[PDB]
Amino acid sequence: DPMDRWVGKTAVVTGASSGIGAAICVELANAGINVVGVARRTGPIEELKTQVKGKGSITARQCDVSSPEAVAETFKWIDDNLGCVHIMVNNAGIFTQGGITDVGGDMISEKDIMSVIDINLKGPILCSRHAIASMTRNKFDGHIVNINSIAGHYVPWSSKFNVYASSKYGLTGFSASLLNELADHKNKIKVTSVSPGLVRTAMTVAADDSEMPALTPKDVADAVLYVISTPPTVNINELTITPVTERRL
Amino acid sequence: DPMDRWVGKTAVVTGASSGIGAAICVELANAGINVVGVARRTGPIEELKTQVKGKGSITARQCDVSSPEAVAETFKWIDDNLGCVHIMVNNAGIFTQGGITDVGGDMISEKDIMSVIDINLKGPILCSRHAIASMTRNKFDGHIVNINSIAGHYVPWSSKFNVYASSKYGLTGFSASLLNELADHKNKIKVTSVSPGLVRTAMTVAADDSEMPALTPKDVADAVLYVISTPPTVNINELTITPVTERRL
Amino acid sequence: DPMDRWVGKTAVVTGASSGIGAAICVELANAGINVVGVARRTGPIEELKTQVKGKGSITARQCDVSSPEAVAETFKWIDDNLGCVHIMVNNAGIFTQGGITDVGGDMISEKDIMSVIDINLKGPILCSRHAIASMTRNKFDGHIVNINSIAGHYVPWSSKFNVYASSKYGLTGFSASLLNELADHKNKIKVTSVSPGLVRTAMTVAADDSEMPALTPKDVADAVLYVISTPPTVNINELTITPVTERRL
Amino acid sequence: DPMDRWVGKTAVVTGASSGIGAAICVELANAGINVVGVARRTGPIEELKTQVKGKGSITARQCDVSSPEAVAETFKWIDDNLGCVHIMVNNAGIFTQGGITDVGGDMISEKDIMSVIDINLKGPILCSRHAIASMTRNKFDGHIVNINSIAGHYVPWSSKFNVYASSKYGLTGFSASLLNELADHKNKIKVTSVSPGLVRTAMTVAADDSEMPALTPKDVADAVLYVISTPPTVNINELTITPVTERRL
Ligand SMILES: NC(=O)c1ccc[n+]([C@@H]2O[C@H](COP(=O)([O-])OP(=O)(O)OC[C@H]3O[C@@H](n4cnc5c(N)ncnc54)[C@H](OP(=O)(O)O)[C@@H]3O)[C@@H](O)[C@H]2O)c1
Ligand SMILES: NC(=O)c1ccc[n+]([C@@H]2O[C@H](COP(=O)([O-])OP(=O)(O)OC[C@H]3O[C@@H](n4cnc5c(N)ncnc54)[C@H](OP(=O)(O)O)[C@@H]3O)[C@@H](O)[C@H]2O)c1
Ligand SMILES: NC(=O)c1ccc[n+]([C@@H]2O[C@H](COP(=O)([O-])OP(=O)(O)OC[C@H]3O[C@@H](n4cnc5c(N)ncnc54)[C@H](OP(=O)(O)O)[C@@H]3O)[C@@H](O)[C@H]2O)c1
Ligand SMILES: NC(=O)c1ccc[n+]([C@@H]2O[C@H](COP(=O)([O-])OP(=O)(O)OC[C@H]3O[C@@H](n4cnc5c(N)ncnc54)[C@H](OP(=O)(O)O)[C@@H]3O)[C@@H](O)[C@H]2O)c1
Ligand code: NA
Ligand code: NA
Ligand code: NA
Ligand code: NA
């Protein structure tokens, strides 16, 4: 069974309290992995424990991935308590509807526009550096999965998207340059960008979304479990997953 | 079991006589699908029948996918003999090492340079049109899988690549515009681009490739079976699969 | 004056009878270049001669760029009559509104769908090979300009676009691989992709286009003259030019 | 003369003390524009004044574009002293050679890896928001030019590039989403991404670069003056400029 090498290993999943990240934590735990689920608000993560049917576990830890200090505190706690990080899932992300500028009367705040870059692009850079330092310390070839977006690969028509696409284009380039760097030094850690179209979560992408095709969080988690299950010599660089009949925004 | 809806259905796989396409035909047949494997030379396809362990089958038919007449003859035979096409796998493709021009003393022939476009880009356009006409005639939402390349998404450094990358950039755009068109008319047929890095097959990509990481044909077929297995409401638009430590050419 | 090195040289411009190509021929001739304008119908090209104010000229020749034989006959006539090709402008192209398939009741003919690939992608491959063979025979570092499209860089939402975007994605990859090949062999011929948004020409992109921002043919020709004017050591790989306030289709 | 509408207007150019930005400031001033050149170290900007031959001017101001407070102080000084910002050139940027991780023994510091995102991506977001607020306050349709990179459009092979490509992919997406937003609200401000290959400046891209083709700073400034010169109804969305025979890293 391809998930056997992962039973009993440790996965860190950012954005674990809601949405895609909450579904990844349950599917990993059901596969026998010990998950450390992190978010700024941990109450909902604690509650996922009642859905674990398999032999893995879910542990909640508080962390704002935009803050280098908070990320270092979480990785130090993991190292002290669980040991090696075997899987890193950079799933936390935000989206604020409105404009870069006020030409449409919907400019987002400067705090929000900076936050979208810090969480969606800086967050995965900082977490990937801590995860890989743990993996290489432990002589272990693990797997980094970055939850990207179709908007990391095309420019949305909607003018509500501000710098969200910019952050995900950032993450496309980051993901590829990280895998490039590992490969150039003959290191066997895997990196995958998983890019969803619309998913029903707590992220409001379109307020008027009730009639639009939308994936479930489990559909995305299912795709993440497939890419972790692939053999140690096989990378899935990119897996773009969208609901059928989607019309991108 | 997610492959249950596919048992007993018909898949057409171009480039079935060798490489990735031969591995797709065996993995589909082992999953209970009746495969029609096509290539310009059918002897090796006939031989794959001895590897079928499951309840599906493999039938060889001769076809040059660059020829509209040959493609129409094969689709007419399928319609007359097996009925609806449920899965279409556009896997046939070629690569000729050398240049567009003679500036390096390795210009490829005009026949070869035209052939690479006709097989790798026209072939999937013609086969997808026949497959979708069959699916919609039969009121069936099937799945089109196009075997692309990492070189459909970046420009190779090697000057041996001529218009191969152009043909695969063509196929990236084709694949996305086809799924766009189906979605815009609320049609639920799925389309996937699967983009491999180096795979050990009969295609000579690099003559000096013995030390390079390379996927096996089964690794690619495994990824094709995963995308066909996904639920009817879930598209995998793109699945890029590469051997670990690959340094793209 | 940066256009001085070009006065008295020979430019070949495909699609010269209408639209962007007719405007390129007049702007080149006004700059002192001797233009050979080609299209399937030459009457309108003959008429551009009355607009030449400068010291260059415009000569009409009949050629269907999708046909290897017609392209070879035109290049042989040029070689026999004018000598070296110094500038090649691959501007001819077509667009047929409607679908790859009939799911929307607007499927384009198989002849048309094959023609779009043959003219828009094969045509520039064949012309570039003849132009570069002429340049290198003559020990001259000339300039290849390919008229691409914004749709060579993103997938249109409109389902009227069929394989047009595929052909222009093809041309993006072709253009880059050609410049890659020249550079890898230390050859100094320049290659530029010029990618327009909507331009008012004889190509019907949107039937309901009267209120949409649209470039004029001269705006595009102006950009082509800028890229030819750049110094021999400076490449403009890509110049994307769009009317202000455009909303891509 | 197409630069007439710009004589006497105000341009802000970040990264003015060296390299491409210093060359842009002199070429703009020679065209009659009043330039405000900004960088963290202003001494070299003061010195460019002796190269102004035309009727424009160069004024030095200190600003770290990664700091929202420093950017707001500079824009407030400009508003108080010169008035409307007519042209914004986001040219400041950094590159630190080495890795995201330490797998190759060349990991860059966490301060540096965060700085590359803050300067190269946050900087242009903050400056563009202040510039556009000034333009729209003044009812003026100006021009935003972002100095990107070929590495904002492909993933470098070199493992010395860390998150530099990520930052420039960020800037590609930012630039396009900004122009998207302006167009969607029928605003006529122009946005251009100018993407150079190697340029000889104070940025060390390759330590062993003496034999590589390299643009001069003036070549890039020349391309920036061309895109500002284009008519008010014509956008140059992207202008990629590279030295001839370049082999991208
Ligand atoms: N249609 C879609 O929903 C869609 C489409 C494609 C891609 N995505 C991507 O999917 C990923 C998951 O989002 P989702 O759709 O599941 O949205 P969601 O339901 O809002 O979940 C976002 C999760 O991230 C956490 N988070 C946000 N900022 C954080 C930070 N600074 N530090 C730590 N945790 C943080 C949130 O919890 P806290 O607020 O408590 O910290 C929450 O757990 C994101 O990267 C998103 O861009 C979503
Ligand atoms: N490293 C790699 O091998 C690699 C990497 C990424 C992508 N790919 C893609 O993988 C696909 C499969 O190629 P492969 O690597 O498995 O190579 P392969 O072993 O050479 O197989 C190519 C198959 O296509 C058939 N074929 C070629 N031209 C055809 C035509 N005109 N009509 C019908 N069949 C045709 C060949 O048989 P006949 O000659 O008998 O017709 C053979 O069955 C291609 O699209 C290729 O571009 C391969
Ligand atoms: N909005 C736009 O118009 C737009 C946008 C972006 C890109 N483009 C690109 O701009 C280029 C020029 O088109 P246009 O807009 O100027 O359209 P146009 O007015 O229709 O001109 C097309 C020209 O190409 C010629 N042509 C077509 N097929 C040919 C072939 N097989 N052999 C030789 N000549 C051929 C046509 O003449 P014959 O029919 O007599 O041969 C005509 O001279 C095309 O590559 C197009 O894709 C146009
Ligand atoms: N091969 C190349 O050189 C090349 C290739 C393509 C793209 N680019 C892009 O070209 C642009 C210009 O760089 P260059 O090559 O001319 O390099 P350069 O000679 O090092 O100039 C960089 C300029 O940016 C300023 N700067 C850096 N960080 C800043 C910050 N936080 N705040 C304000 N100013 C800042 C620097 O001055 P201070 O340190 O005093 O602040 C200097 O004036 C960059 O965006 C770069 O990515 C360069
Ligand atoms: Na991977
Ligand atoms: Na799909
Ligand atoms: Na060029
Ligand atoms: Na512009």
- Asked if D236 reaches chain C (Cβ–Cβ under 8 Å), the answer is yes
**Angle separating helix axes A123-137 and A68-81, nearest 10 degrees:** 30
Strand B190-196 with C34-39, pairing = unpaired
Distance CA D198, CA D182 (A): 31
D55-84 in b/e form (b: 16+ CB < 10 A) is ebbbbbbebbbbbbebbeebbebbbeebeb
CA of residue A222 to ligand 6 center, whole Å: 15
Cβ–Cβ < 8 Å for A174, D166: yes
Cβ–Cβ < 8 Å for A106, A154: no
Distance CA A180, CA D163 (A): 11
- Which has the closest alpha carbon to A145: A6, A11, A7, A45? A11
Where does chain B have alpha helices with state H?
19-30, 43-48, 68-81, 110-117, 123-137, 164-184, 217-229
| A164 tagged catalytic | yes
CA of residue B24 to ligand 8 center, whole Å: 47
Instruction: Name the minimum distance, in Å, from the CA of B43 to any CA of chain C.
Output: 30
Distance CA D238, CA D148 (A): 9
Q: What is the 8-class DSSP label of residue B13?
A: E
Q: What is the CA radius of gyration of chain B?
A: 17
- The helix (H) or strand (E) run that includes residue C36 is strand C34-39
Q: What is the CA radius of gyration of chain A?
A: 17
- Asked if A181 reaches chain B (Cβ–Cβ under 8 Å), the answer is no
Q: Is the CB of C145 under 6 A from ligand 3?
A: no
Closest residue by CA, ligand 3 atom 16: C19
- Which has the closest alpha carbon to C3: C24, C48, C33? C33
* Ligand sitting nearest the alpha carbon of A164: 1
CA of residue C19 to ligand 3 center, whole Å: 7
Q: Which atom of ligand 3 is nearest to the CA of C200?
A: 3
List CB contacts of A37: < 8 A, sequence separation 6 or more: A13, A16, A17, A21, A22, A25, A45, A48, A58, A59, A60, A61
Rounded (10°) CA dihedral D238, D242, D247, D249: -60
Residues in chain D within 8 Å Cβ distance of C195: 238
Instruction: Name the minimum distance, in Å, from the CA of A97 to any CA of chain D.
Output: 12
Q: What is the 8-class DSSP label of residue B107?
A: B
Cβ–Cβ < 8 Å for C144, C132: yes
Q: Is the CB of B15 under 6 A from ligand 2?
A: yes
Instruction: Name the minimum distance, in Å, from the CA of C110 to any CA of chain A.
Output: 25
In one-letter notation, the amino acid at residue A246 is E
- B13 forms beta bridges with B37, B89
Q: What is the CA radius of gyration of chain C?
A: 17
Q: Ligand 4 — pocket residues by CB below 6 A?
A: D 14-21, 39-41, 63-66, 91-94, 119, 147, 149, 196, 198-199, 201-203, 205
Distance CA A144, CA A2 (A): 17
List CB contacts of C78: < 8 A, sequence separation 6 or more: C10, C12, C36, C61, C85, C134
Resolution of the deposited coordinates, in angstroms? 1.6
Q: Of C101, C113, C122, which is closest to B114 when you measure between CB atoms?
A: C122
In one-letter notation, the amino acid at residue A37 is G
Closest residue by CA, ligand 4 atom 34: D39
Q: Which residue of B has its CA nearest to A241?
A: B236
CA-based angle A199:A200:A206, to the nearest 5? 85
CA of residue C43 to ligand 3 center, whole Å: 15
Cβ–Cβ < 8 Å for C11, C127: no
Q: Report CA torsion sign: D63, D64, D66, D67.
A: negative
**DSSP assignments along A170-196, one per residue:** HHHHHHHHHHHHHHHTT---EEEEEEE
- Which has the closest alpha carbon to D27: D242, D202, D224, D248? D224
Q: Look up residue B173 and give its two tokens.
A: 């755009």
- Asked if C206 reaches chain A (Cβ–Cβ under 8 Å), the answer is no
CB neighbours of residue A188 within 10 Å: 16
Say how many residues make up chain A: 249
Distance CA B135, CA B142 (A): 6
The experimental method is: X-ray
CB neighbours of residue D22 within 10 Å: 27
- Asked if D142 reaches chain A (Cβ–Cβ under 8 Å), the answer is no
Where does chain A have alpha helices with state H?
19-30, 43-48, 68-81, 110-117, 123-137, 164-184, 217-229
In one-letter notation, the amino acid at residue B112 is D
Distance CA B173, CA D150 (A): 22
Q: Is the CB of A224 under 6 A from ligand 1?
A: no
In one-letter notation, the amino acid at residue B2 is P
* Ligand sitting nearest the alpha carbon of C232: 7
- A11 forms beta bridges with A35, A87
Q: Look up residue A154 and give its two tokens.
A: 């095309």
CB neighbours of residue A218 within 10 Å: 16
Distance CA A147, CA D193 (A): 27
Distance CA D28, CA D35 (A): 7
Distance CA B239, CA B249 (A): 19
Distance CA B29, CA B162 (A): 36
Distance CA C182, CA B98 (A): 12
Rounded (10°) CA dihedral A68, A69, A73, A79: 40
Q: Of C101, C126, C158, which is closest to B129 when you measure between CB atoms?
A: C101
Distance CA C131, CA C88 (A): 6
Catalytic residue among D154, D164, D169, D226: D164
**Angle separating helix axes B164-184 and B123-137, nearest 10 degrees:** 20
Q: Look up residue A10 and give its two tokens.
A: 């440790």
- Asked if C171 reaches chain B (Cβ–Cβ under 8 Å), the answer is yes
C13-40 in b/e form (b: 16+ CB < 10 A) is bbbbbbbbbbbbbbbbbbbbbbbbbbbe
